[PDB]
Design a protein around this ligand. Sequence first.
Ligand SMILES: CCCCCCC/C=C\CCCCCC(=O)OC[C@H](CO)O[C@@H](O)[C@H](O)COC(=O)CCCCC/C=C\CCCCCCC
Ligand code: 78M
Ligand code: 78M
Ligand code: 78M
Ligand code: 78M
Ligand code: 78M
Ligand code: 78M
Ligand code: 78M
Ligand code: 78M
Ligand code: 78M
Ligand code: 78M
Ligand code: 78M
Ligand code: 78M
Ligand code: 78M
Ligand code: 78M
Ligand code: 78M
Ligand code: 78M
Ligand code: 78M
Ligand code: 78M
Length: 460
Amino acid sequence: GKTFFGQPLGLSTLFMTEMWERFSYYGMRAILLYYMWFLISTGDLHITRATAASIMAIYASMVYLSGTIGGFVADRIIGARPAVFWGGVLIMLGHIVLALPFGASALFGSIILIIIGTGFLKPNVSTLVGTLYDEHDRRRDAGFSIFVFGINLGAFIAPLIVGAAQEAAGYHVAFSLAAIGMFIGLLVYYFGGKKTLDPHYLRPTDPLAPEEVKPLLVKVSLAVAGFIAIIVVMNLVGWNSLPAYINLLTIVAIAIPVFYFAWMISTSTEHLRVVSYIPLFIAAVLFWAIEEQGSVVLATFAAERVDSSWFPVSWFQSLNPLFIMLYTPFFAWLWTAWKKNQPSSPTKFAVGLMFAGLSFLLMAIPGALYGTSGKVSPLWLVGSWALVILGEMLISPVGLSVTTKMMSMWFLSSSVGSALNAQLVTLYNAKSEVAYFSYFGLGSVVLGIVLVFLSKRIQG
Ligand SMILES: CCCCCCC/C=C\CCCCCC(=O)OC[C@H](CO)O[C@@H](O)[C@H](O)COC(=O)CCCCC/C=C\CCCCCCC
Ligand SMILES: CCCCCCC/C=C/CCCCCC(=O)OC[C@@H](O)CO
Ligand SMILES: CCCCCCC/C=C\CCCCCC(=O)OC[C@@H](O)CO
Ligand SMILES: CCCCCCC/C=C\CCCCCC(=O)OC[C@@H](O)CO
Ligand SMILES: CCCCCCC/C=C\CCCCCC(=O)OC[C@@H](O)CO
Ligand SMILES: CCCCCCC/C=C\CCCCCC(=O)OC[C@@H](O)CO
Ligand SMILES: CCCCCCC/C=C\CCCCCC(=O)OC[C@@H](O)CO
Ligand SMILES: CCCCCCC/C=C\CCCCCC(=O)OC[C@@H](O)CO
Ligand SMILES: CCCCCCC/C=C\CCCCCC(=O)OC[C@@H](O)CO
Ligand SMILES: CCCCCCC/C=C\CCCCCC(=O)OC[C@@H](O)CO
Ligand SMILES: CCCCCCC/C=C\CCCCCC(=O)OC[C@@H](O)CO
Ligand SMILES: CCCCCCC/C=C\CCCCCC(=O)OC[C@@H](O)CO
Ligand SMILES: CCCCCCC/C=C\CCCCCC(=O)OC[C@@H](O)CO
Ligand SMILES: CCCCCCC/C=C\CCCCCC(=O)OC[C@@H](O)CO
Ligand SMILES: CCCCCCC/C=C\CCCCCC(=O)OC[C@@H](O)CO
Ligand SMILES: CCCCCCC/C=C\CCCCCC(=O)OC[C@@H](O)CO
Ligand SMILES: CCCCCCC/C=C\CCCCCC(=O)OC[C@@H](O)CO
Ligand SMILES: CCCCCCC/C=C\CCCCCC(=O)OC[C@@H](O)CO
Ligand SMILES: CCCCCCC/C=C\CCCCCC(=O)OC[C@@H](O)CO
């Protein structure tokens, strides 16, 4: 019968929904840093470029952190299908805000809308993909990989289209194209979903029992009052600059996994089978930090150290999803052409971190060889993204499987690694380039070597 690459036809609806949301997301992040540079250059935004780079990292950290709770809100309160829709509406409003004739005053409102909207949408679109298959259907893994291909496709064409529009018609038009991309996703999702999506998911599947409402409200109210209390204390003692608020979000983002690990210890049955995952969680954090610096540090390098006079420099951001799409069929082959081998997940995470470290070590070569005052070939960045995505092909598909032996924890390692970036990327500039690349690249390599050592002990 009529299928979508052998899958239920409803997959095409969710395929396009996420392809256009990712288009709106990565099209925005391909030019947002340069947009802040521009506002700084005109005197409208009064921050350093180091702070702007820090804003990009904590922005990503909050988006992934917001995705850790969006599944709960849909499953218990509003439903998975309304969560995707209203999440898409909030994302669209987030980009419209940047298309309005405002300046730096609109940056915070746009960031908040997209953080909340992406938290509602991203975890619950993947959830809706699963609802196309029951628990016995073997097509589940094939349908998700096709779904992932739509993710990378939108992430691939967005910097090309949006980056070109910025260079031709300016930032406001470019951001409006991101808003239009999400709008297209809303049209296809709304009318397409009504035809093929199970109406059971218009409502929460585990709605709150009557006695559960109050303790949740107490739990939410205590968290907001405490967070607001901290901001009050900060302004009393003088810690009220934008870097101080970024440091607050950094501490909050890192304190979540460490508190969820400190009292997770207190049953020797898996007392140490949970300590097992910690050398792997720290490995995932450091890999995601390197990977998410491509839109910050490597975006800075592309704009300042690469002779890219004949094409928009935001196009470099397409190399990340391009290498993902090129690598995946080879690794799908490898993970079943090598049935006999299938090396251990702790070794996969160890080697994956070493490739990420090799991507930065490679970036230290041109500055050490030619100096940092000139311009170098774009192929240096191509080789860097080739190496780091090779590290992703190891840790990303096996990643959720290690901790199970929830994607929120893998939303979480991305948030912590991106929160770590909010501190580190302020260290990057033309004078620190070689030392920044060489030492964070070397440190990432040796931490992949100690993990290979520890890998024998971890498997138990
Ligand atoms: C069948 C698939 C095999 C793919 C594996 C090979 C990787 C692909 C291409 C490697 C090309 C090597 C670099 C070429 C080179 O040396 O540049 C020559 C060029 C002359 O016009 O000159 C230079 O001007 C350049 O400025 C000099 O600087 C360098 O070349 C330093 C290069 C950085 C080191 C890279 C060396 C080896 C990378 C191999 C990676 C393989 C990993 C596969 C998992
Ligand atoms: C999607 C971004 C990847 C771009 C990769 C481009 C690969 C280019 C390799 C050759 C190095 C740049 C050559 C510069 C060049 O030829 O310019 C033409 C001439 O007008 C001098 O500017
Ligand atoms: C006005 C500014 C508000 C911005 C909203 C951003 C909200 C971001 C995050 C809030 C959720 C934090 C709690 C996340 C959490 O603890 O879940 C982790 C857990 O699921 C691990 O599996
Ligand atoms: C109108 C206010 C903004 C939109 C409301 C949604 C704001 C995001 C989160 C509010 C807290 C909801 C409860 C989240 C929660 O308890 O997460 C628990 C965590 O274990 C999830 O698995
Ligand atoms: C700025 C935009 C304001 C909001 C415009 C859209 C509101 C118009 C009608 C409400 C539609 C709500 C549909 C919620 C929903 O669950 O949709 C799921 C989708 O699969 C269709 O069932
Ligand atoms: C429980 C709450 C967890 C904390 C979530 C709060 C995250 C809220 C906002 C993060 C935005 C990052 C900073 C935005 C920013 O700096 O832009 C404004 C700046 O350009 C104005 O000069
Ligand atoms: C379909 C409903 C949501 C999608 C967004 C709809 C509005 C998008 C674009 C309308 C025009 C965008 C504004 C362009 C603009 O004003 O910037 C250009 C000009 O101000 C600078 O010279
Ligand atoms: C200044 C530019 C306009 C700013 C407001 C843009 C809002 C325009 C349209 C709202 C689109 C709602 C989502 C699109 C959609 O498919 O909704 C269908 C649903 O509402 C039908 O019941
Ligand atoms: C930051 C501001 C957030 C404002 C909205 C956050 C609300 C968080 C917790 C309160 C949830 C109460 C929802 C009650 C509900 O819908 O269920 C009622 C019913 O199912 C019980 O029988
Ligand atoms: C539950 C216990 C509450 C105790 C306080 C918890 C939060 C403690 C410290 C938060 C500090 C925010 C980040 C530090 C900071 O503001 O740095 C300031 C510095 O960069 C110059 O302003
Ligand atoms: C999440 C619970 C409600 C919290 C209400 C208070 C939220 C206030 C700040 C959240 C963090 C964003 C801080 C970014 C910021 O405001 O920078 C302003 C900048 O001008 C510093 O002077
Ligand atoms: C008993 C609980 C386990 C032991 C406590 C572990 C510490 C818990 C939370 C601290 C989060 C790490 C500090 C965040 C960080 O490294 O950045 C600091 C920087 O932003 C301040 O300028
Ligand atoms: C071939 C694939 C992996 C690529 C990484 C291989 C290169 C490994 C390390 C290169 C970094 C060399 C750093 C040299 C250096 O820092 O010198 C310092 C001085 O020359 C610059 O200030
Ligand atoms: C198989 C990987 C190919 C070789 C990778 C090893 C690359 C090691 C260093 C990068 C080239 C070194 C550039 C020369 C250098 O750093 O010296 C500069 C300094 O001595 C001048 O004062
Ligand atoms: C799996 C792929 C590993 C990548 C290997 C690392 C290769 C990285 C950089 C090679 C730099 C060669 C650039 C020389 C070049 O062709 O352009 C000449 C330049 O002067 C034009 O601007
Ligand atoms: C098990 C949880 C994983 C925790 C991974 C994060 C590691 C903990 C703290 C990292 C602190 C990074 C501090 C960066 C730093 O101080 O240098 C940058 C600073 O100059 C920014 O102004
Ligand atoms: C020599 C240390 C053990 C080697 C472990 C293998 C690590 C992979 C490639 C070698 C990386 C060499 C990095 C050289 C380096 O960091 O120099 C720092 C430079 O800034 C000082 O000249
Ligand atoms: C064990 C968990 C590792 C997570 C954190 C790893 C890095 C932690 C702190 C780094 C801050 C110290 C910065 C060292 C440094 O000088 O780098 C800057 C240099 O390369 C350029 O000047
Ligand atoms: C300056 C030298 C650069 C090249 C050295 C890098 C390779 C050297 C040693 C790597 C293997 C060290 C031993 C690791 C090992 O086999 O531990 C056993 C482990 O597999 C059991 O889980």
